[PDB]
Ligand binder design. Sequence first.
Ligand SMILES: *[C@@H]1O[C@H](CO[C@@H]2O[C@@H](C)[C@@H](O)[C@@H](O)[C@@H]2O)[C@@H](O[C@@H]2O[C@H](CO)[C@@H](O[C@H]3O[C@H](CO[C@H]4O[C@H](CO)[C@@H](O)[C@H](O)[C@@H]4O)[C@@H](O)[C@H](O[C@@H]4O[C@H](CO)[C@@H](O)[C@H](O)[C@@H]4O)[C@@H]3O)[C@H](O)[C@H]2NC(C)=O)[C@H](O[C@H]2O[C@@H](C)[C@@H](O)[C@@H](O)[C@@H]2O)[C@H]1NC(C)=O
Ligand SMILES: *[C@@H]1O[C@H](CO)[C@@H](O[C@@H]2O[C@H](CO)[C@@H](O)[C@H](O)[C@H]2NC(C)=O)[C@H](O)[C@H]1NC(C)=O
Ligand SMILES: *[C@@H]1O[C@H](CO)[C@@H](O[C@@H]2O[C@H](CO)[C@@H](O)[C@H](O)[C@H]2NC(C)=O)[C@H](O)[C@H]1NC(C)=O
Ligand code: NAG
Ligand code: NAG
Ligand code: NAG
Lengths: 133, 421
Amino acid sequence: SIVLEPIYWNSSNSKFLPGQGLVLYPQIGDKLDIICPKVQYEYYKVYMVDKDQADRCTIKNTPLLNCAKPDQDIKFTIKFQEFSPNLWGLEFQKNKDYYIISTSNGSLEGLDNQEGGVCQTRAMKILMKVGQD
Amino acid sequence: ISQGVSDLVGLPNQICLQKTTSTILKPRLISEGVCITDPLLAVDNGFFAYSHLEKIGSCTRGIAKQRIIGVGEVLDRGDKVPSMFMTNVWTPPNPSTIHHCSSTYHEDFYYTLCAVSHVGDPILNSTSWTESLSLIRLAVRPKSDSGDYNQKYIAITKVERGKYDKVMPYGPSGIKQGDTLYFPAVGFLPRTEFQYNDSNCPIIHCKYSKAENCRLSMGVNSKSHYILRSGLLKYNLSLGGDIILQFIEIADNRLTIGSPSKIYNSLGQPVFYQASYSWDTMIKLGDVDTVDPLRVQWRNNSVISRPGQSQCPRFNVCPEVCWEGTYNDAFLIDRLNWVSAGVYLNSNQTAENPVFAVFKDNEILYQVPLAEDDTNAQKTITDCFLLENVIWCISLVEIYDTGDSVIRPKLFAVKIPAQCS
Ligand SMILES: *[C@@H]1O[C@H](CO[C@@H]2O[C@@H](C)[C@@H](O)[C@@H](O)[C@@H]2O)[C@@H](O[C@@H]2O[C@H](CO)[C@@H](O[C@H]3O[C@H](CO[C@H]4O[C@H](CO)[C@@H](O)[C@H](O)[C@@H]4O)[C@@H](O)[C@H](O[C@@H]4O[C@H](CO)[C@@H](O)[C@H](O)[C@@H]4O)[C@@H]3O)[C@H](O)[C@H]2NC(C)=O)[C@H](O[C@H]2O[C@@H](C)[C@@H](O)[C@@H](O)[C@@H]2O)[C@H]1NC(C)=O
Ligand SMILES: *[C@@H]1O[C@H](CO)[C@@H](O[C@@H]2O[C@H](CO)[C@@H](O)[C@H](O)[C@H]2NC(C)=O)[C@H](O)[C@H]1NC(C)=O
Ligand SMILES: *[C@@H]1O[C@H](CO)[C@@H](O[C@@H]2O[C@H](CO)[C@@H](O)[C@H](O)[C@H]2NC(C)=O)[C@H](O)[C@H]1NC(C)=O
Ligand SMILES: *[C@@H]1O[C@H](CO)[C@@H](O)[C@H](O)[C@H]1NC(C)=O
Ligand SMILES: *[C@@H]1O[C@H](CO)[C@@H](O)[C@H](O)[C@H]1NC(C)=O
Ligand SMILES: *[C@@H]1O[C@H](CO)[C@@H](O)[C@H](O)[C@H]1NC(C)=O
């Protein structure tokens, strides 16, 4: 019935464990905010990928977050439901697994890197186990 | 005096025209594992057109099970409230191949234009879509043993698409002007043929926006092969034998990406609504200056917007490269003060909290929630009409509460109040 606790997508977030990232377990009906905080700024493009793309730390898609505005707070909110303003069919099914990663190296020159980056080096990835535990 | 349900025309009873924070609107609701999706609603002359797709599983990725295309009548249920009764239903053979139907009414029939695809939604697979269009005609009052009167396919001999490679219907309902029918449509233009001066992009007061953002947001992503341009598909019934559909592009006045749209008559003049699927997130509606070429006199509305995603959420006004949003139309009910009724989703980035609102360009006069907050809601279609000279609105709302077995649209009847206090 809940609003989950917000995730700040910056490298100093201790909830991204080394090598593991963040694992969430959201249930159907929850709401979540993924925030790229205001400002030396960290630049990211954040994507939702499949299990294989998260394990190899690769992207090939339209970003969920485009954190390239040092002046402003950029926010992305999810409700884990069937309906969405996403035109590509964003949905979250219970007992299904969803992966959010970024392949950026954090600098403005590395916003569009498509391999490696901050997913394999800082474990800046989210694993959402929808409708579990 | 005129009784029954009839078009919003003439001089209706006046409606309340000042801001009121108390609830003066009274929505009336009219009549496992399935999701009912892709809805359509049209209200014209005491009749209506309806459509949906029933899926097994998810509303996005479920297996398409049944497509319904139906017409009926809107009547006084006896207690001075409109309700709807189906009279003629058709279910085409292959539900997964019918996309983006659009219905226009003419005296005995509704004419419904759909797109046929074996590659999915033409919008999401544009380059692989072979343009193929279908026309089904349905009698609003069917007759027994009447041959092709009740239900009829109409074979489309020719499509005149101008400079566009592909066209298809894009939006719930259109209008008639005499014996000519117009459907809301979209045109597929290759980016290399798109004529656009990047200096028309309004990037002043938006320090992070670039001049290319408008042109790049004319397609479903920056590097789409096509750009999408709204318009109309024109079908002139007075022609003999010839079923020709021509595309009429919308003018580049306040241009945004082609999105589902609606053209309707209210109080006697055509009105246009275009969904906001990119960076310009304030509501886009207005009176039609010219039908051919199509030109819309967009209102400068600062109160109605729609939920988005990270790049262009609700109330975004600065050009970004984004393709997101919802379809939530509004219906002009008084041209003298330009007040409209419609449903908007009261959420910044989530599809929830539907609200029925009556509003002007720069203010919402009165509104009411249709459910509770955190109630999930999506596409909304509103048509308003007269029931013995009282303005009524019927809204089709994609809605469900978390935990429902069945995701289903709902029909809401809202009487527009006469006095404000
Ligand atoms: C839903 O989203 C709403 C819109 O968000 C904004 O637009 C989108 C497109 C993105 O760009 C977002 O990044 C934006 O935030 C949001 O409402 C906005 O909330 C802002 C506060 O968070 C609020 O204020 C900011 O602007 C004022 C000045 O405002 C002027 O112009 C408008 C235009 O008409 C006028 O109506 C206003 O009256 C103002 O004149 C700033 O002064 C303010 O900041 C401070 O100002 C300092 C200057 O001295 C500055 O240095 C420093 O930054 C200070 O913080 C804000 O920056 C926006 O006006 C408001 N917009 C609208 C259209 O309403 C919703 O927020 C609700 O959220 C709750 C929690 C609460 O914060 C409410 O205030 C707010 O309405 C979003 N809703 C939810 C639920 O999240
Ligand atoms: C729809 O088609 C009819 C049939 O041609 C058009 O009506 C005729 O149009 C021309 C130009 O107005 C006249 O010279 C003819 O004498 C008209 N004849 C009749 C019987 O109407 C009509 O203009 C077309 N309308 C649209 C919107 O395309
Ligand atoms: C919405 O706003 C625009 C811009 O303010 C209006 O466009 C102006 O319309 C007048 C009268 O038609 C012209 O003289 C101006 O040249 C237009 N452009 C401007 C002022 O930049 C438009 O008319 C407004 N629409 C409505 C319905 O009010
Ligand atoms: C980021 O990646 C680009 C190449 O993609 C590289 O040139 C740049 O030096 C990188 N910066 C950092 C800080 O890793
Ligand atoms: C697009 O069309 C191809 C055939 O050309 C098909 O194989 C593919 O699955 C389609 N994808 C979508 C998303 O429609
Ligand atoms: C774009 O507009 C500007 C000023 O309105 C004009 O000078 C310029 O020539 C136009 N661009 C092209 C390519 O014609």
